Write a protein that binds this ligand. Structure first.
Ligand SMILES: Cc1cccc(C)c1OCC(=O)N[C@@H](Cc1ccccc1)[C@H](O)C(=O)N1CSC(C)(C)[C@H]1C(=O)N[C@H]1c2ccccc2C[C@H]1O
Ligand SMILES: Cc1cccc(C)c1OCC(=O)N[C@@H](Cc1ccccc1)[C@H](O)C(=O)N1CSC(C)(C)[C@H]1C(=O)N[C@H]1c2ccccc2C[C@H]1O
Lengths: 326, 326
C-alpha cells in the first residue's frame, strides 16, 4: 500500500506526527505544515530554556551526517529562532533519503504553544520557492531518488474528531474518501493555494486566493468580509478573547460556498460550529476568524479538511478534494 | 487633593495608564504593575519589529538626561528583552523626580500581548528588593524628595466594569470606598504579599502566601487546590483553551474566603463569574485559574480588586482593603 504517519491532535489542530533523523533513527514530534518548506529540529547545542524538554539531534551519533553549516536566523515579533543546516537521513515509515534540515541552536518566544505541547519542530511540506535555502521539497526528493512513484501526498482527518488522522505519501488511498476526486490548479507554486469564488451570506468575494493549511484549527476570512458576514447574522461578540458565540440550532447562519469552475465546496453550520456546553447545550462557538494575511486571502484549516479529504500533487501542480469517509 | 492617573482597560486587565519622561515630557502608555519593580521604556535605538509602532524615548532631546548605561538582559521562555539604564525626570501628574529606568534596545517575543495592544512598557510599583539594580521604588523616591507626604498609593477599580479606574499617590482618597479600611502585614517586602487562610469549598489552605497583582485579570490558585475545588462543584472543562464553564445562577458554587486574624475578605460567585452570552444568558465563565507559582501561592487580580479598593503603604509595610464605592 502507501506509507502512513498517524496524525496526533494537540491544541485542536490535527497534524502532529513522528519522523526520524539519522542512521540511528532519532525520533521527533513534528508539526507537518503544508504552508511552509523547511524541516526544523532542536540541536544538541541548543542552550535555550525552551529546548530543555524536547528531543535533540546529535550529529556526532549518526554515521550518515554531512556537514553543511549555512547559518539561519528567522525572526518575527512572535519569536526568534537561529541555527544551522545539516544533511542527514530523514525517515517516514519505509521512506528514507538524505535531506537538508535546520538544526536549531537558539529559540526564544513562540509561547506558550511551543514549550507546553510536546512538538519538537516543524516539518514543512510546501513548495521549493517558499523554502530557506531553495531546497527541493522532501516528497519531491523522495521521487528523484526512485523511492516513490509519484510526488504526491494526502491528508485525511476524521469527520468524527476524537479519532487519529493520516498523512499518506506516494499514492492515493481509496479507503479515505467517497465519490469522485476533484482537482484544482494552484495559482502559485508557493503554499498550496487555489483560486476560488467564495460566497458566505449575500457577502461574497470573487477570485479569492484560498490557502490550505493543516496548522490552522479554524476558517480564515478577510476582516472586511468577516464583519459583513457577522453583521445581521445574529452572531455575538462578548469576550475576554474573541470567539464568537451563537445558538447551535441557529437557522439563520448560511452555508459556506467555495466555487471553482467545476465543483462547489460547502461547509454547513454543523461543521463550522463547536459545542461549548456539556450541560445544555444549545450554545456554540463559531470557528471562523477575521484575519488579514494578504489582499483577498482565505485560509481553509481543520474544519474544512475534516469534511474534505485533500490530495497534494507536486507533479501536476494541483490540489485534490473529496468527501471524507468513516 | 491627591495625584491621579486614569486606568485604561486593555485585555480585560484594568491598569494601563500614562506617565511622562524627560524635561520635554514625552508621553508613554504603561502597565502599572504592583508585582514588579523597574520602569521599562522603548529606546529610540530599538531596532526590533515590535518597537516599531510604540513610543520611544530620545535621551538626546531631554535636557535633564543623565548617562548611566548599566546593561540589562532579562530573559524568559516567553521573550527576551535587553537595554540600558538612564536617569531622567519621571512624571505622573504634578509629581516629578529624577528616576533610573531601562531604555529598551532590543525586544523579542511576548506575543501577541505586546505588539497588538498599545502599551509601550511597564511601570513597576513593587519593593526595592525585587528590582534590577536595587533601586528605591518611584513613590519612595518621591517621598525622599519631599514631593509627597507619605509613600503610599491606592488602586481603585470600578465595581461596574465599563468605567475608568484610578491610581492615586501620596494619600488615601475617602470617595473611593465604604466602611473601615483594614490593614494587613506584608509577609515579605518583595511583591505586595500577605499571609491569609483561604477557604473555597470545604477545600482550604492555611497560611497561604497571597499576592496582589493588577496585571492579572483573574484569580489564581495552586493546581492541587483548584482540582479539589472543581471536582464535585459542577464546573465543566470543555475547551480549545481552558475556561471553565458553569451556570450563572448556580447555587452550588461557594463563596471565596480570605481570612486574616481580623477580617475575612469574600468573593461571591457574582464577582468571579463572567457572562458568555448576550442572547440567553444562563451561561458563565469561571474567572479562577490553576497556576503554580510558588509553594502555597495565590494571586488576587482584577475580580478581587473590583470589590475591594486597595491601599499600598510603603511606610508601614502594609496593604489596606475597603469595599469599593460607586
Ligand atoms: C514554533 C516553531 C518551532 C520550530 C520552528 C519554527 C519555524 C517555529 O515557528 C516559528 C514561526 O515563525 N512560525 C510562523 C509559521 C512559519 C513557520 C516556518 C516558516 C515560515 C513560517 C508563524 O509565526 C506562526 O507561528 N504561525 C503562522 S500561522 C499559525 C497561527 C498557525 C502559527 C503557528 O505556527 N502555529 C499556531 C499553533 C499551532 C498549534 C497549536 C497552537 C498554535 C498557536 C500558533 O502559534
Ligand atoms: C510585556 C513587557 C513589555 C515591556 C517590558 C516588559 C518587562 C514586559 O514584560 C514581560 C515580562 O517579563 N513579564 C513578566 C513580569 C515581569 C516584568 C518585569 C520584570 C520582571 C518580571 C511575567 O513573566 C509576565 O509576562 N506575566 C506575569 S503573569 C502574566 C501572565 C499576567 C504575565 C503578563 O505580564 N501579562 C499577560 C497579559 C496581560 C494582558 C494581556 C495579555 C497578557 C498575556 C500575558 O503575557
Amino acid at each position: 500500500e502507501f506509507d502512513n504517519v498517524e496524525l496526533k491532535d494537540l491544541a485542536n489542530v490535527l497534524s502532529f506526527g513522528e519522523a526520524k533523523l539519522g542512521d540511528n533513527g532519532q525520533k521527533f514530534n513534528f508539526l507537518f505544515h503544508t504552508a511552509s518548506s523547511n524541516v526544523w529540529v532542536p540541536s544538541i547545542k541548543c542552550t535555550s530554556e525552551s529546548c530543555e524538554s524536547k528531543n535533540h539531534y546529535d550529529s556526532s551519533k549518526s554515521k550518515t551526517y554531512e556537514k553543511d553549516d549555512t547559518p539561519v536566523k528567522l525572526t518575527s515579533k512572535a519569536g526568534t529562532i537561529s541555527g544551522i543546516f545539516s544533511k542527514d537521513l530523514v525517515t517516514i515509515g519505509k521512506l528514507s533519503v538524505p535531506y537538508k534540515f535546520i538544526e536549531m541552536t537558539e529559540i526564544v518566544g513562540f509561547e506558550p504553544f511551543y514549550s507546553e505541547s510536546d512538538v519538537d519542530g516543524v516539518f514543512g511540506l510546501g513548495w521549493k520557492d517558499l523554502s530557506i535555502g531553495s531546497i527541493d521539497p522532501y516528497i519531491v526528493e523522495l521521487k528523484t531518488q526512485n523511492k516513490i512513484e509519484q510526488a504526491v501526498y494526502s491528508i485525511y482527518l476524521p469527520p468524527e474528531n476524537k479519532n487519529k488522522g493520516y498523512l499518506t505519501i506516494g499514492g492515493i488511498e481509496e479507503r479515505f474518501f467517497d465519490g469522485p476526486l476533484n482537482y484544482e490548479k494552484l495559482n502559485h507554486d508557493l503554499m498550496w493555494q487555489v483560486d476560488l469564488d467564495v460566497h458566505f451570506g449575500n457577502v461574497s468575494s470573487k477570485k479569492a486566493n484560498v490557502i490550505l493549511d493543516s496548522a490552522t484549527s479554524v476558517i480564515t476570512v478577510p476582516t472586511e468580509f468577516f464583519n459583513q458576514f457577522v453583521e445581521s447574522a445574529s452572531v455575538f461578540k462578548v469576550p475576554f478573547l474573541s470567539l464568537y458565540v451563537t445558538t447551535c440550532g441557529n437557522t439563520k447562519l448560511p452555508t459556506l460556498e467555495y466555487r471553482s469552475p467545476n465543483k462547489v465546496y460547502t461547509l454547513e453550520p454543523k461543521q463550522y460550529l463547536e459545542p461549548l456546553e456539556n450541560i445544555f447545550s444549545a450554545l456554540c462557538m463559531l470557528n471562523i476568524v477575521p484575519i488579514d494575511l494578504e489582499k483577498n486571502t482565505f485560509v481553509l484549516g481543520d474544519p474544512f479538511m475534516r469534511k474534505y479529504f485533500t490530495v497534494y500533487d507536486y507533479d501536476n501542480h494541483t490540489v485534490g478534494f473529496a468527501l471524507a469517509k468513516n
